[model samples]
Target: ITGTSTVGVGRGVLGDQKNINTTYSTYYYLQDNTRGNGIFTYDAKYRTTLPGSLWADADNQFFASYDAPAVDAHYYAGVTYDYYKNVHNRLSYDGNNAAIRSSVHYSQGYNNAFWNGSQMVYGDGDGQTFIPLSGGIDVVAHELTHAVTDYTAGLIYQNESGAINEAISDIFGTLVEFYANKNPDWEIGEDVYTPGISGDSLRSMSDPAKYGDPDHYSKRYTGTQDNGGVHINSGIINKAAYLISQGGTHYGVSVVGIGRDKLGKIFYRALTQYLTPTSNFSQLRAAAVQSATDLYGSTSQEVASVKQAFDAVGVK
Candidate 1:
């Protein structure tokens, strides 16, 4: 879940979007919401599979055959709710009594999932590599994170904004994972999967070296896709986090990152407590360090850690 700093994008109508479509389940479409009716909603529940108390039944769920939309939607919703409440002390997606809705099996053979301003939507998945999208904590945390992004940065979803949008999601998504402690150590998407993947995660925070794809953004990782590598570049920040938390800054070898206790709080504070929809890297970095100064002390180890982590990331 490593991400780049910030690219840049603008607000505009998303077009040709469908829940059932993906960049081949690896790619995504830009859904246009000028009319606003096509956006899907999320329903929170704990059950998986049809015929359970969660979905409407196999007749209406969604699938080329037949499935219940409520099944995956509600289960993941519950996961989202629990992730927020247990981790960040948030009650729901909006931090209010506001209810969050999710739509599952959105379109025919849909291969991706996205957050649509009001609700979260899911496609049935390609089925060859994944299922209707459920039972994964990181993925759920990731999408719910989009809600947090929309509420805060309102990132335009193109280049920099898009990168920020993705980074925050990974940041909190990992926090959600840490808070969940389902696996004890921090790893993204270990709980959610389609089976036979051999690994329990989609990303690694403690060690990105495990993936070895080289598509990530370390000083050397390549920025391949996701709007200027918003998704891939995210790994850089993720590495920054690991360095900071795992005590990377203290050593001169790894950008002199920060410590987890300070870095985590600072980032979260900026995302949910300080940043706005138009926030960017410079501002985000300042907010984070300022948050450390406020929480610890201007010249405290915490502040030093914050500064060091950003510097290591080449944020200046």
Candidate 2:
């Protein structure tokens, strides 16, 4: 429906009030006309259908109980978009200001979310495990970063490359959270994983081993499950990224802390310029080293920290 641009007020899944971009046709719809081609949100109505319908609200306000996920799915995508554009000079996931689209309530008790190589899909979690996955800003950023990875590195979604892909998402997701300065931490999905549970998250970058993920290469799952443990083995890379940003020692290997901003700069450069679809852990180490060198010089401490962080994680 043709409409005029407007702003709506809404409470997110976590009970946070935020301004949402909407369009006023016959009614207010969850369409933002501010960002690249506008960030479009849809309601799946707890079904398996794709991009069900553009959410329509009778009023320009959205405080209804059911509007929680839709509000967040729309808001967080804009935040993620702003982060890429302002921080990295990236226009969007493709660095071309591509319109971001998302669907909430994808299925009944779906308990997960993903970027289907094109648009974002979120599920209203089985309350026992999750609420709405979009309630977590990091979760939203992580899924969208997959698109960025697809457009840049085109990292395959299996084996070592897949693990790298997963880690890249987690890494930037954490950065986006920090970029927003919203109670940021090294944990992923903490905000939405378990509403009743505190200090628990789907994954931990600071200590991946806390959640039974391997922080060391020796502990990586070599089986053919989970796309060669793409999700499971990403702990190694996550650990490395955490170390690069915060500095740490494991198995007697130590990494000099380079801080989060520098870590992001190095990794973002690597992802956009050096990495390939098939790049494995070793290749990743090389790419990161080159990226750090490019930014800080071959003899810079940032380059040394990049090498040390990967070594601490036993990537090499």
Candidate 3:
């Protein structure tokens, strides 16, 4: 719909007020032309098909209960785009200002979100384990980061490579959350995970072991399930990243905290410039070290912490 561009104010699934960019033809639609070519959100209508109809509102105001997921999906996609553009200096997920599109309300009681190599998709959770996944900025950023990884690293989604892929998403996802600075924490999906419970998340970067995830390589799962424990084993790399940014001592190895900005630069460099489709943990360590050295010199503390962090996580 090519009508007038407008700003629409609405409340997200979490009941927070937000202003979203919209396109008004006859009715206001959730097509944000303010960012990258554009950021569009659609209603999946609780089915598995795809990017459903562009979300439309009778007025430019999206206040209906059913509109909550679309509101947050559209708004958060814009925020993720802004983070990449302003912080990473990347135009969009593709580095070419590719239009960001997302679909919400995907399937009834669905409990996940993902980037399908083209657009982002979110499920309104079963409501026990999660609410609308788009309610969590980290979840939105994590999915979009997969798009970035596909464009750059192209890490294969299985075994060690897959764990690295998952870890990369978690690392940047948390970074994006911090960039937004809205109740920032190192926990993933805390805002939308298990509403019946409090202070729990899908995963924890600060202490992956707290949630039954490996905080060390020696504890990695070798089972054939979960695509060789892609999600389970990523805790090893996630711990390493957490240590790099916010120092920690593990297995008698102490990593000096280098702060978040440097951590983001190093990892972003590694992801975009050094990693490959089949890279393993050792390769990731090499990439991170080289990335830090390139940005902060061979003798810089950043380089040292990069090595120490990997060592602390037993990544060799």
Best by lDDT: 2
Q: Please list the residue runs of candidate 2 whose C-alpha ends up more than 4 Å from where it truly belongs after superposition.
A: none
- Per-residue lDDT for 78-150 in model 3, tens only? 8889988898899889999999999999999999999998999999999998899999999999999999999
The sequence of per-residue lDDT tens digits that candidate 2 reaches over residues 174-197 is 999999998999999999998888
lDDT for position 222 in model 3? 95
Ranking by TM-score: 3, 2, 1
- Supply candidate 1's per-residue lDDT for 113: 64
> Residue 6 in candidate 2 has what lDDT?
95
In the predicted model 2, the residue pairs found to clash are: none
Q: Which stretches of candidate 1 lie over 4 Å from their true place?
A: 1-54, 57-72, 82-89, 207-225, 249-263
Lowest lDDT sum, 10 consecutive residues, model 3, at 58-67
Arrange candidates by lDDT, descending: 2, 3, 1
| TM-scores, each model vs. reference | 0.67, 0.98, 0.99
State each model's CA lDDT, in order.
0.53, 0.94, 0.92
Better of 1 and 2 by lDDT: 2
TM-score of 1: 0.67
